[PDB]
Each structure stands twice: as C-alpha cells, then as structure tokens.
C-alpha cells in the first residue's frame, strides 16, 4: 500500500528533522553529524528525556532536568570527546516540532530497534540468558532482549521467541496478569506449528511454578528447529536520515519500507563515518555496523556474505569492538575512517521462520532426491517434528537476492552453496 | 610544499565556496548539486563569463527535466570575484579547464584533428590538454603533452606578436624533451626565421620521438566543482589542511565524496563511472594494467565501454533518462608524476635476452630478435637513441602505489605484471 | 543473383542425380553411400573419364570389406552427360575437382614442390588450388592462390600457344593483385619477350608481397558429391530453390546431412571431422581463431591433429577398419569472400600505439617498436606499402558470423578475440 508506505516515510522525515535540528543547535559539521558515535549519542538523548519511568523516579528522588553523553569534535587536528549537558524539555520541544507537534513513539521505537540491532551484532547475551534459566546456546532466539519489555507494536514484532521466553520466565519467578496474557499471546503469534501454540495455551491459561517454566524452556528448545515468526526490520542511524532529508529526499512523497528496497537503496547513497582504535580493522568495523544495519547478527553468514559481496566473518575473528567508546579511552589515538554500508545485491526481510519425488529411468551412481517434509507430514508431537526435520532441508523456495537496479522484485537470483557466534 | 599547499588549498576553497553560491542561486537540492551534468553547466558559465547559460537538471515530480536558464556574464563574474576573496583569480579558473580537458581526453579520441595538421591519428598518448586552448595558463602549458605542442606549433606555421608565440611555445616543447638531442632539434626549429615546411618536418620528427623517448608532461588530478563545493559545505578548510593534485589529497578526497550522472537507456553506469576516474586522475593515456591495478577493478579500453560521453544533449529526449552514483573510488592510490620515464643514461644494462641450451629436448629457442639486431646529426642521433630503446625497460625503479591510510607515502607497493585505452577500435586491434 | 542460383542450382542438381545414378549401378546401400571413401572413388571415376575404376566400400557380414571394380570411360561419360539434361556439363565436373583441391588443401603440405620451383615453403597460404591441374576451369581460375599462379608460371618459364597461356595467367594473377604497383609488375613480367630469370625473381617478391598485400583469392564451399545425391534423393529441388557456393545454402545442406568416414585404429573422429569441415568451407588458410568461432568447437592446428588423410590406400588391411559419422555441422555461418582484405587507401588510422606515465610507478613502458621504427621504382613502392602494414589492422569492417535461422544476413555478430594451421611442425612453432 502507498499508505502504510507513506506513514512509515512520514516518521522518517520525523527522525531526519530531528536529527538535523539537534546538529544546527550543537554547531556540529556535516561530517561530524555523519560519525555515528555523534548519532549514537543524539539517539540516546531523545529516549532518555521520553523516558517516563527515569523521569518520574527523577522528580521523585531529587540535574534531574538535564540529559546528556559524549560528543565528538575535530579540533586542532584531533579528535576531542566533549560531555554535553542538554535540557531534557527542549529535546522533547525539537522532537515535536520536528514530527509536527505528535510526540510520535512509533519514530522513538525505530531508534530503539536500531539500538537493539545493533547490541545484538555486538554483544553475546550469555550472562543473562544463564542467570533467568535457560541455555546460552539459545543466542540466536534473543533478537530484541535489550528491548524494554513495553516497547510499542513494532517493537513486539522485532523480539524472538527467546526474548519473550527470558520476560515470560522472569515473571514466573517473580493488572499484571493481564500483560502476562497479552505476553503469552505475542508468543502464542509466534510460533508456526499447531503443537508449539497448543502448549502455549496450557502455560498461559494457569494461575505458575516449575510446571510452567519448564514448558517455556522446551518450546524455547524447539525453537532452534521448529523456528518462529520474527520481523526484520532496516533500522539504520539517525544520521543516515537526517542526511538524506537535508539532501533534498522527502520520505513521506517517495514512500519508504523497512523490509524492501528502500533502506539499501538509501545506505548506497549515504557516508557514514566511526573513530577507530589503534589496532581496529576498519573493514570490521563496517561489517558489524552493516550487519546491524539490516538484523543480520543471527542470520547465516554464507547468505549475508552473498548479499554483501564481501566476506561476513564470524565475530571470534572479527578485528574490532564495539561502535561506542569508553569515558576512559584515549582520544590521541583516535582516527576517523569511513563505513563501508554498501552491498552488491539486495534481499526482502522475513517475518518467517508439482512433482514431489524423482522415478529413475538411468542405471547411474546418485541419490534419488524427494522433498522429505512435504511427504513425510501427512510434548510428544514436538520431539517427534524435531527429530524429522534436518539441517539440510530447503526453505524459502524459489526466492532469492535482487539486483540493486531491479526496484520490483521481478527477477530472483537463487544462490548455490555459517554461525556469527560460533565457537 | 607548505607553501604550495596553501596556495592549491586557496583556489579549490574558492571554487569550493563559487559552487556552493551558485547552488543556491539555482535553489538546487544537495543531490541535484551533486550531478555532475550540473557541475559541468555551472563550470562552462564561469568560464564562457571570462549572456552565459546552459543546461540545468532537476528532478521534478519522480521525473528529470531539462531547462536552460541564462545569466549575465557580469554577475557571474562578480561571484566568482567575491567567492575568491576579491582576487580576480585566474588559477582557479584555468583548473577547471584542466579537468574539462581530462574529461575530453578521456571521451574523444581527436583523429580529424590530427590529420587535418597532418600529424599521424596514432599519436594519442602525446595529446594531453589538446582541447585546451592556446596560451592557457602556466599550469595549462605544464598539463599539455608534446604532440599538442607540435600541433599548436603547426597551426602556427599554417603583427610581430606571432614571433614571440611562435618562440614561448618552442621553450615550453623544449622544456619537456628528456634528451639534449631533442632539445637542440627545438632550437633549430626556434631559431628559423619564416617558418614553413622543413620546421613542420622536424616536429613531426619530434612527434614520433616522443613516442619512444618520452617528454616531461604533468599529471594533475582536477576534479568536478561539485566535489570540491560539497567538501566545504561539509566542514572541509582546504585552506587549513592545504591541498595537492599529485598527492594524496585528491583520492581522499573522492574517498569522501558521492558524485551522480545522468545515464542514457543502453549504457553501464560502471563503465560510465571508469571514464570519469580515468578523467578524475588524467589518466587516459596512462597504461591500462597500472589504472587496473590502482583502482581495483579492470580499467577496460575505449571501443569496450558501453558508455557515450558525459554531457546530454539538448538533442535526446529526458523521459528515458535516469541517475545513477559514479563509483570514482580506489583500491590504492599513487603520486601523479610530470616524468616521462627513462630516456637516456644508459648504465649498463642487466638482463637476458637469449638462452643456452642444456638439455637435449625438441623445442624452439627464443631469443630478442629486434634487441639482438639492433646493434647492427641531431637527427640519425635520435633514431639511434630510439633504437636503443626496449620496451621491456622499467621506469620509476623503486616506486609503487599506496593504501590510503599510508598518507605520508612511506610503505610502496610495486605490481608485479591490454595497455592502450585507444588501442581497440574498428581500424586496429592495438 | 536469381540467375546465378539458378546455374549453379543446376549443376549441384545434375552432380546430385549423377551421383544417385552412380550408387543404384553399385548397389551400394545409402548409408554406404554416403561413405566419404566411396563418394570421393565415385568423384574420381568420372573425372578421369574426361577403363577407369578405385576402391569401393562395402559392409560385408560385419566388416568393412574393400574391392576395385572398373568401368568404360565411355559408359561413365555417358552416365553424367544423361545426369545433366544432355550437355556435356564441364562445370560440375571443375566443382567436384576444386572440393578435392579444397581436401588436398588441408589434408598435405606441399614444401617438396615449393622448393622445386624455387619458392619459400612458408607460402602455404598462398597456395590454394595447386593440386588443381593447370588450365582448369574458370570457376578453377578464381579458386586459385596468389602462390599457385606463380608456381604455375615458373614452371612455364623452367608451339606459339605457350605465349597465350604464358599471358592468359599473368591476368589471371594481376586480376587478383589489389594494389597498382603489384599489378604493374605483372605487366612488367608479361610484357618480356623470351621470359627467365628477372621474371622469376619478379614472381618470387610479388609472392612475398601477397603474404602482406593479399590477393582477391575466390573461395568456394564445394562438398562431397554424396552430400548433393543426399539431398536429391530426399526430395530436395537445388534448381527450384536455387543455391550459392559463397552464401548460407552448404551451411544449410551440411546441418540437415550426415556423412560418414572409415577411421584407422590410432584415430580420433573429431579430428578427422575437423579436416573434412575445413575442406568443405574453403578454410585450410584461415585464420583458426575465426574458424573456431564459426565452428563452434576449437579448429586445432594440422600438426596436433590424429588423424591421416581421407583416403585409404590399398595397402593397408580393412580388417581393423571401423566407420564413424563425420560431424560438418557449425555454430554459425559466414559468407566466404573473394576479397584479401585492405591492401590500401590509408584514410588515416585511429590507435595508439605508446602510452603516457600519469602514475610515478615502477613497471616497463609498453610501445609498438615495428610501427613507430617503419617511418624512417615499383619494387621499392611495394617495400615502402608493406612495410606500412600492420598484424593489426582490421580487414572486413562492419561484418560478422551469421545465425543459422538468418538466412538473409540481417544481424551481423562481430566476435571479440593459435591462428596458422600449418603452423605446428616439427621445424617450426608458428
Ligand atoms: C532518482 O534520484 C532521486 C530520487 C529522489 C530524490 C532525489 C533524487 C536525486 N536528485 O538528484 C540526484 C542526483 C538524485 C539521485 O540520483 N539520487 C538521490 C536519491 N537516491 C535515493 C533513492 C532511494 C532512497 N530510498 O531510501 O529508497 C534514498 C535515496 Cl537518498 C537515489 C540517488
Ligand atoms: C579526520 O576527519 C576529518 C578531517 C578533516 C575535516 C573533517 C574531518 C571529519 N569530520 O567528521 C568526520 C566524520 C570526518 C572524517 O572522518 N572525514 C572528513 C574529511 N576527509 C577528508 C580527508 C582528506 C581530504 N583531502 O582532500 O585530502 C578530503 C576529505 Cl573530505 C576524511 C574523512
């Protein structure tokens, strides 16, 4: 739909508005405005003033009034880091203005799913996954776990099967049983086979001990196999944004999406810039910052390196840290490289987890192939579709990659042929 | 260096601040500003002023149009003025000329031209800043290769100020040449009162000369106002930083950059993108192996490019146009240089050019038929100079390209190895 | 064009009848038939006729068994008047002769009588139609190389009716001349009373003159008389539809023939269909990069070939002969030329033959020797002309290969590029 094109490219407008007024008011440069350190940093102060419940405790607890973090600078040759100190009501008067008047929470949760993206492309949760109670293998189903557990309709869609199991299970241990059934409802839409959303309902119609945990910690299992329905969302840095409207792109006439063309469209034409570190390779840098760039973290590494064109290295052997730096690194040996965000081609972003069989007529040496799940389909009924499925069974059939040229996806390219946090 | 560095630095920050006042003026969107058809209108007004118009590209209603507005050549003149700081500025001016001429050795090959001065249409390599007008500036005369030279210098041949012409342009030949030989060949040429025949027969001499035994011609990196206009808008001080054309400054700075073109219905936006690299580092006549290598990708000849020239005409209908990002970025990066290599010297030699055999097997036995043989005033001494000359024989020893954090030069990579970009046509398969 | 397929229409149609006449005499089967061994006995048979017999095929319990029958001259010259529609039909007879010149071409080398008559036996490619005997047909005359002529006119020079013939083929051979000064020495030898020496030296140099400055050589697709029975036989009507030696029509008739060959016991078939495919078009002297490329499939050099001649001898046993399909099919089609290619005019040139450092990098600084080295009463002006020549420069502008479905010409494919096929030898790697 246009429409629904329209209001997506209506809040991007919002967070382009913004973040130029935010860099007008701090006299950044246009370069310094496109280092995503800067970005990062002028995210974190509209969340932080919109953030009721820091707010509230705030004006509770007695500069309450003011947020603030690191900026950065070229001056004299180098690289300064400077804490700024902003009023918190301003920040919310430039938001507004900037959307219009609305106080557009929709926009705020699209910087919050970035910032998620991109703690996921960083960081292993193993610390956390261990202390609720389940296992630290399970990284792969804990998309949006550095989400606030109230975090808006897209910020619902974003969260894997993991993520809801870990908020689920952290109530179980702990008005509000009605959030535990609209919860259990957001996991129940998740999972695509019968016999996992059965065995929500018995978990989420109770009033819940070991019983119910232990139900959680199995259909979280399955889910390594029997995957759910997480959403993909392009969510890049607001500077990303405030560039392109400052260049002359209206978002709200052109229409925009998260999960199509669009947001690749936009990362080849935009320059992002990061401070590097002594020892950091820059092509590292640009493979994380990518990766989090299209929810890339938990994919096969193969399929992105496809798209991408480049190598996706797997984060053991990845030359670099994280995007953000320290109040006590060294600004002295700091250097400012660009972004590589490009790809050779591009790929539509999932919310998903004729003849059938081959009569041999050549008295030839091959296996005799037969697509094994459509044949063979037709607690005790999860183990049973666990054990059927293998590593090797096809899906997504007859998709694949689009030239960056091709804007309608007309002609598939099908890929001949993988863990980012593999041991 | 310093010093250089701040003067280069002053005239592109002029042309810089003119591009961004006369984006305004036009009320063109960054994008828009960005194209480097706009670019190329907005440099021809500034220099068709020393009525001016052209054509200008905007994107109205998910569609590209054409207009062509006029301006008063006193009103672009007073911009240019007062974008560089009072100072009438002529450097600045002659620079865009420069990347105009690039641009055009890169696109045309000039053959009609060539024969109509009756100089050999293979001459090419030795037409750098031929487009160029006569009597451009100092850095035109520098950036301008010897078979333009002898072409001025005939046209001339074909009201005493025509002496002295006739005699700075004989100094700017001789300056270029790399041998005495040469160089005393230009001096008879000079010295000859009434000019005709005999002088036209010397520099065509002289032409082909240069072929083997290559003239001293700069190299200098000139860019698209557009990318020098975007770079100060974004907070870029060249006059801070300073600036050079034969240094790293240029490729860093299309490092940093994101120019667009117009491209027509059959043509490859990548191949359109190498015509405007080779322009971007004066690299037409450059070997291709070597511009391969520094840009990463394959530098294809001429008669391969899927590509007409940059400018669209008024002729061509704008429906079917579309734009596209020029990719004007590189794997390394290398100093431009005014040498033409190794002309003379001679210290020995060092190498193998036969093969004894030790085995008793059936094969042929090579050897270097025309070096071998090769053994066996002014003018016969520059034939035997050229005779002398191989192919094979290495020039720049001990050079080699750069990564682009390696901005002080310190660390060359020298390439272990299709060289004429005009060498694939429908008359020759060079 | 109408009236020309209409003749040559005729006589491909009268060879046909002839030829099934010839195999229902025999008994012969018509697989067996169109076994190249019993087509080119039969070819032979009634050209020795204008008792005659050879060696005939048969498949006798399994095994390929072989017999020598005979036949009176008189009842076979009776056999092919009667095939023809009463006349004596002379130029069906020079085409079954100019297809075993066209084989002779590509199967032997002919050094031995090169060096008797005193000519380089690096010719090759100038001997198309020198096993074709001496006063053959017209359509012999046009077939015939630069070389052939000049073997045939020494051999003169090594009864008054002996002048004519002397001057009859001195306008055969100045006719296939392009240039002016070729054509001037020709007359120069003609116009001698009592011809030697000087005339045989004039003959040598305007041989090596051919090599560079090529002549106007015809070239005929002229196939296996089996292939024409084939097709009469199958309902094909060569005078109602016409057919040309030079356009698609034997590309057609060889994709809807199949021919067979017998093949020796240390023989590849592919290679054997190579030679057989090279003869039917004419190709023996073509470059091999173009006969690949028609082909579709590599043309490989005559020294790496496995394979003998077509023929077998008598004395070798049948017992370990075995038969295999001849694949003469190709990729694409192309028209064969009687042009040599540019041997003159010189509008211009357009190229580049040096290049011009941009880049201060170590490497070797390419640049065509021969060409820029060439520029420093009939016999000095052909030197002077081929020594202007280059390898690469481009004959045939604007023309290419043909799809088998265009039969009219329309889309011309121009490809993008091993080139002598009596290259490869125990002497020589050329
Ligand atoms: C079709 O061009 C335009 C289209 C729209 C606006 C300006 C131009 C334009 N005006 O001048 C030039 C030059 C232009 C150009 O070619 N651009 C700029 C916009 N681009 C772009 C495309 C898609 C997305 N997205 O998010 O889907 C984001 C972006 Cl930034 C594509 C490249
Ligand atoms: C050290 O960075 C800076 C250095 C100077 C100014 C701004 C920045 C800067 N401020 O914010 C960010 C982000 C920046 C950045 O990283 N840049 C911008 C300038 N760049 C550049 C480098 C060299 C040439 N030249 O022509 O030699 C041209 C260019 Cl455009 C290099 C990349």
């Given at each position: 739909?246009?429409?629904?094109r329209?209001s997506v490219?209506?809040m991007?407008d919002?967070?382009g508005?913004?973040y130029?007024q935010?860099?007008?008011?701090?006299?950044l440069?246009?370069?310094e405005?496109?280092?995503?350190?800067?970005?990062?940093?002028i995210?974190?102060?509209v969340?932080?003033?919109?953030?009721?419940?820091?707010?509230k405790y705030?004006?509770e607890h007695?500069?309450?009034?003011?947020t603030g973090?690191?900026?950065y600078?070229?001056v004299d040759?180098?690289?300064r880091?400077?804490?700024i100190?902003?009023?918190k009501?301003?920040?919310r008067?430039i938001?507004?203005?900037?959307?219009?008047?609305?106080?557009?929470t929709?926009?705020?949760?699209?910087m919050?799913?970035?910032?998620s993206?991109?703690?996921?492309?960083?960081?292993?949760?193993?610390?956390?996954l261990?202390?609720?109670?389940?296992?630290?293998?399970m990284?792969?189903?804990?998309q949006?776990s550095?989400?606030?557990?109230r975090?808006?309709?897209?910020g619902?869609?974003?969260?894997?099967?993991?993520?809801?199991?870990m908020?689920?299970?952290?109530?179980?241990?702990?008005?509000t049983?009605?959030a535990?059934?609209?919860?259990?409802?957001?996991?129940?839409?998740?999972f695509?086979t019968?016999?996992?959303?059965?065995?929500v309902?018995?978990?989420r119609?109770?009033?819940?001990?070991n019983?119910?945990?232990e139900?959680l910690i199995?259909?979280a299992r399955?889910?390594?196999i029997?995957?759910?329905?997480?959403?993909?969302k392009?969510?890049?840095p607001?500077?990303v944004?405030?560039?392109?409207?400052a260049?002359g792109?209206?978002?709200?006439r052109?229409?925009?999406?998260?999960?199509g063309?669009?947001p690749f469209?936009?990362?080849?034409?935009?320059?992002?810039y990061?401070?590097?570190?002594p020892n950091?390779?820059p092509?590292?840098?640009?493979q994380l910052?990518?990766?989090?760039?299209?929810?890339?973290?938990?994919?096969?590494?193969?399929?992105?390196?496809?798209?991408?064109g480049?190598?996706?290295?797997?984060?053991?052997?990845?030359?670099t840290?994280?995007?953000?730096?320290?109040?006590?690194?060294?600004?002295?040996?700091?250097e400012?490289?660009?972004?590589?965000?490009?790809?050779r081609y591009?790929?539509?972003?999932?919310?998903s987890?004729?003849?059938?069989?081959?009569?041999?007529?050549?008295?030839?040496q091959?296996?005799?192939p037969?697509?094994?799940?459509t044949?063979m389909?037709?607690?005790?009924?999860?183990?049973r579709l666990?054990?059927?499925?293998?590593?090797?069974?096809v899906?997504?059939?007859?998709?694949?990659?689009?030239?960056?040229?091709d804007?309608k996806?007309?002609?598939?390219?099908?890929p001949?042929?993988?863990?980012?946090?593999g041991?």
């Amino acid at each position: 739909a246009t429409e629904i094109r329209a209001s997506v490219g209506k809040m991007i407008d919002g967070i382009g508005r913004f973040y130029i007024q935010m860099c007008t008011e701090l006299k950044l440069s246009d370069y310094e405005g496109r280092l995503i350190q800067n970005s990062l940093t002028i995210e974190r102060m509209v969340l932080s003033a919109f953030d009721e419940r820091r707010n509230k405790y705030l004006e509770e607890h007695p500069d309450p009034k003011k947020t603030g973090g690191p900026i950065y600078r070229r001056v004299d040759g180098k690289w300064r880091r400077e804490l700024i100190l902003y009023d918190k009501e301003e920040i919310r008067r430039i938001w507004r203005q900037a959307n219009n008047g609305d106080d557009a929470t929709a926009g705020l949760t699209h910087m919050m799913i970035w910032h998620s993206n991109l703690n996921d492309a960083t960081y292993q949760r193993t610390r956390a996954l261990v202390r609720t109670g389940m296992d630290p293998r399970m990284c792969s189903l804990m998309q949006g776990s550095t989400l606030p557990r109230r975090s808006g309709a897209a910020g619902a869609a974003v969260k894997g099967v993991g993520t809801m199991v870990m908020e689920l299970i952290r109530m179980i241990k702990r008005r509000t049983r009605i959030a535990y059934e609209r919860m259990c409802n957001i996991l129940k839409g998740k999972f695509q086979t019968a016999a996992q959303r059965t065995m929500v309902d018995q978990v989420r119609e109770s009033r819940p001990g070991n019983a119910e945990f232990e139900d959680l910690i199995f259909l979280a299992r399955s889910a390594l196999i029997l995957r759910g329905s997480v959403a993909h969302k392009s969510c890049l840095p607001a500077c990303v944004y405030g560039s392109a409207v400052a260049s002359g792109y209206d978002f709200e006439r052109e229409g925009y999406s998260l999960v199509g063309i669009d947001p690749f469209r936009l990362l080849q034409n935009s320059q992002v810039y990061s401070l590097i570190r002594p020892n950091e390779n820059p092509a590292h840098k640009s493979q994380l910052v990518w990766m989090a760039c299209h929810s890339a973290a938990f994919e096969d590494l193969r399929v992105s390196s496809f798209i991408r064109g480049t190598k996706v290295v797997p984060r053991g052997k990845l030359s670099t840290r994280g995007v953000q730096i320290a109040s006590n690194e060294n600004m002295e040996t700091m250097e400012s490289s660009t972004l590589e965000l490009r790809s050779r081609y591009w790929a539509i972003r999932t919310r998903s987890g004729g003849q059938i069989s081959i009569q041999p007529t050549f008295s030839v040496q091959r296996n005799l192939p037969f697509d094994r799940p459509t044949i063979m389909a037709a607690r005790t009924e999860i183990i049973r579709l666990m054990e059927s499925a293998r590593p090797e069974d096809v899906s997504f059939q007859g998709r694949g990659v689009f030239e960056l040229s091709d804007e309608k996806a007309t002609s598939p390219i099908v890929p001949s042929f993988s863990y980012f946090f593999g041991d």
